Amino acid sequence: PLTKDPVDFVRQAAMIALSMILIQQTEKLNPQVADINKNFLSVITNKHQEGLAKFGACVAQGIMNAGGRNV
């Protein structure tokens, strides 16, 4: 619910939280992870996002697939 939260900065916090729990998990091992990376891609594509929403998607993906997908 916090992912879609109308308040902006709430959303910032939520995106980074999600990839932190699911840091480098296989996309067969969790269907979950594969959905979450595409969520990020669309946030940056879409121009009806706030600057704080854009900030959270980019950091979160960097965590998510951090270490060169090793850590």
Binding site: K28, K38, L41, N65
Partner: protein, 71 residues
Amino acid sequence: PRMYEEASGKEVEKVATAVLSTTARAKARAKKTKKEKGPNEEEKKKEHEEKEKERETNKKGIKETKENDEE
């Protein structure tokens, strides 16, 4: 990684659905065309050869099976 680059597939999806939707608009005519079409294929060539058409090839309905390592 997984694929996340695309902006060339828009074209191919568009013309891919158009044709199938055209079949629906064309239907009224299509059936009279179809009555002609079937016997003309049985006599001649179905499409270059006429092997295996007894069902739709030799199977009917769903031809799929469930997986036990994926998802």
